[model samples]
Target: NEQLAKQKGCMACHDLKAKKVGPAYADVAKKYAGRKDAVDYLAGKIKKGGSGVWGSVPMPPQNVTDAEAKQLAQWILSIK
Candidate 1:
């Protein structure tokens, strides 16, 4: 999953323990912890992109299929 993140350029903005252009993956995991629909919501956001939640700098839309987005979302939420 880390390899996938690198290939998808997620590492350019997000980190496991530190914030960069976006919030850290660990923070994302904390925010969505135990949410039943977190995966789907995050995957949608990952693909479509959004802003304001983390900051004004928008999360750019990813060049990925639905399955790839889902995998990335799941991996992000799994950070510990």
Candidate 2:
């Protein structure tokens, strides 16, 4: 997953526990912790991209497929 994230440029903005461009993985985990609908929400956001959720500079939509987006969302939510 780490390699996948890296290959997809996730590490260019996000780190495991620290922020670079967006919030940290740990911070994202903390925010979405027990949400029942976060997977879908995050997957949509991963592919469609928007702002105002965390900081500004919206993610600018990813080019990944739906399955990749879902996997990315799950991997993010899995962080602690």
Candidate 3:
């Protein structure tokens, strides 16, 4: 998971609990933790780069593939 995270440049702004360009992994997990569609939701967000809910800072478009986005989203959700 960390490998995919790094390959996708997620570490550029996020970590397990620290916020940078976007919400921390833990915080993200906390917010969307119990949702059934969390995976698909976050996967879309990861693939793109906008947050209608998180904040105005707006997460930049992560340079990763569709599969990578879903993969990272799932991995991030696991941070909880």
Candidate 4:
């Protein structure tokens, strides 16, 4: 699942524990903790990437399904 994210270029700017070109997934999860729209928000971002949230480095649109994005976002949030 996550491997697909890497394969599809998600890892090009993100990591688990540290910031790369973008914020770390763990940090994103922590920042969005308790937010009702986190999953949906990330899914939307994955489908249509832009800037301003993480930085000016706009993530390109990922050719991933909404379900896949949801799964990925959930997985990212699960990281402790």
Candidate 5:
């Protein structure tokens, strides 16, 4: 999943511990901890893209497969 993230250009705007162009995965995990649909919602956002939850600079839609997006979302949600 880590390799998938880099290959898909997610690293260009995000980081594990700090905010760059987007919120850190750790922050995402904590912020969505209470949501039951976190994984599904996150995976959808990873591909379809959206904003407002974080800030105005919107996360551009990614060119990843549904399976890939699911992997990334699950990986991110697992971050501690």
Candidate 6:
């Protein structure tokens, strides 16, 4: 799934440890750590990408499903 996200262009903006066009997964996890809604928030954002929170560069909404988004969010937050 991670490889798929990368191949589908997510990696163009995000990474595990470093900021690129978007915040790193590790960084985001750190910021949202222990938040009950973090997964839901991130999954929603992944499915309906927007901007102004992280930066000006708007993230395009992906064609992923709720399940996929949830999985991705969980995986991202699992980064350590």
Taking all chains together, each candidate's TM-score versus the true structure is 0.90, 0.88, 0.82, 0.86, 0.89, 0.86
Candidate 1 segments exceeding 4 Å error: none
The TM-score of candidate 4 is 0.86
RMSD to native, candidate 1? 1.1
Which digits, one per residue and each the tens of the lDDT, describe model 4 over residues 24-65? 888878877888888999888888888897767767887889
What is the model-wide C-alpha lDDT for candidate 6? 0.83
Candidate with better lDDT, 1 vs 4:
1
Q: Cα RMSD to native, each candidate?
A: 1.1, 1.2, 1.6, 1.4, 1.2, 1.5
Model 5 poorest ten-residue lDDT run: 1-10
Candidate 2: regions farther than 4 A off: none
- List of clashing residue pairs for candidate 3: none
Tell me model 3's lDDT, rounded to 2 decimals.
0.76
Alpha carbon lDDT of residue 17, candidate 6? 84
Give the higher-TM-score candidate: 3 or 5: 5
What's the candidate order when arranged by decreasing TM-score?
A: 1, 5, 2, 4, 6, 3
Cα lDDT tens digits for candidate 6, 16-51: 887777898788787788888988899988989998
Clashing pairs in 4: none
Return the lDDT, model 1, position 54.
Answer: 82
Give me candidate 1's TM-score against the actual structure: 0.90
Candidate number that wins on TM-score, 1 or 4:
1
